[model samples]
Target: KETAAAKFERQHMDSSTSSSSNYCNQMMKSRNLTKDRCKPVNTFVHESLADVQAVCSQKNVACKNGQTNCYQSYSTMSITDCRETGSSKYPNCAYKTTQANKHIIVACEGNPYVPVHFDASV
Candidate 1:
């Protein structure tokens, strides 16, 4: 069952995700680079069966490995590109960093169909 509170949280996450990405980009642009250093960082997160179970703390949902709920099922990644001064691919690869995490709800079982997601720039 979905609650109003859950809906609000989901909406909030959507807005926050975009806001964070923009914030990170601006921060990077402001930094003084010895060379050209501008890269984009992308991140993602979702809920998994394990995570769901872990959060729900109940053995009522269908799950594998004798598990009844899911807890982790989100995925996220990011990469950075550096523009070279000369080469066509002039923009060389500076550095890429990616991070992922799972957000679980322990009090109640989350709607498996509803996959929680988050994306940030930094």
Candidate 2:
């Protein structure tokens, strides 16, 4: 059996954070994430359905100049978009829920590598 925090650290924690890296390193000492073998989606949503609508409003503006599509949700803040070269369109944008995960993940599909994330409680 695994603790809730431990489970989260293994499968859901952000890899970009220093704390997360430490947690991953610690976990690596004992177990490996791939060994756990839980199927993980390439994309996740962490916002409410209503909040996602608002993000759509903000994202739509980006599609104007290029061939891009922006999809967002607040039920579980998750975003995915695609844009072709010389075109301004985003990717296979969808939304999903992360249960009690209070953090939202927003991945923009355009240049400058804008991956925005916000705390649900904040």
lDDT of each: 0.30, 0.32
| Best-performing candidate as measured by lDDT | 2
Question: lDDT at 49 for candidate 2?
Answer: 35
Alpha-carbon lDDT of model 1: 0.30
- Stretches off by above 4 angstroms in model 2 are 1-41, 61-66, 71-122
Top candidate (TM-score): 2
Worst 10 residues of 1 by lDDT: 81-90
Q: How many residue pairs of model 1 clash at the backbone?
A: 24
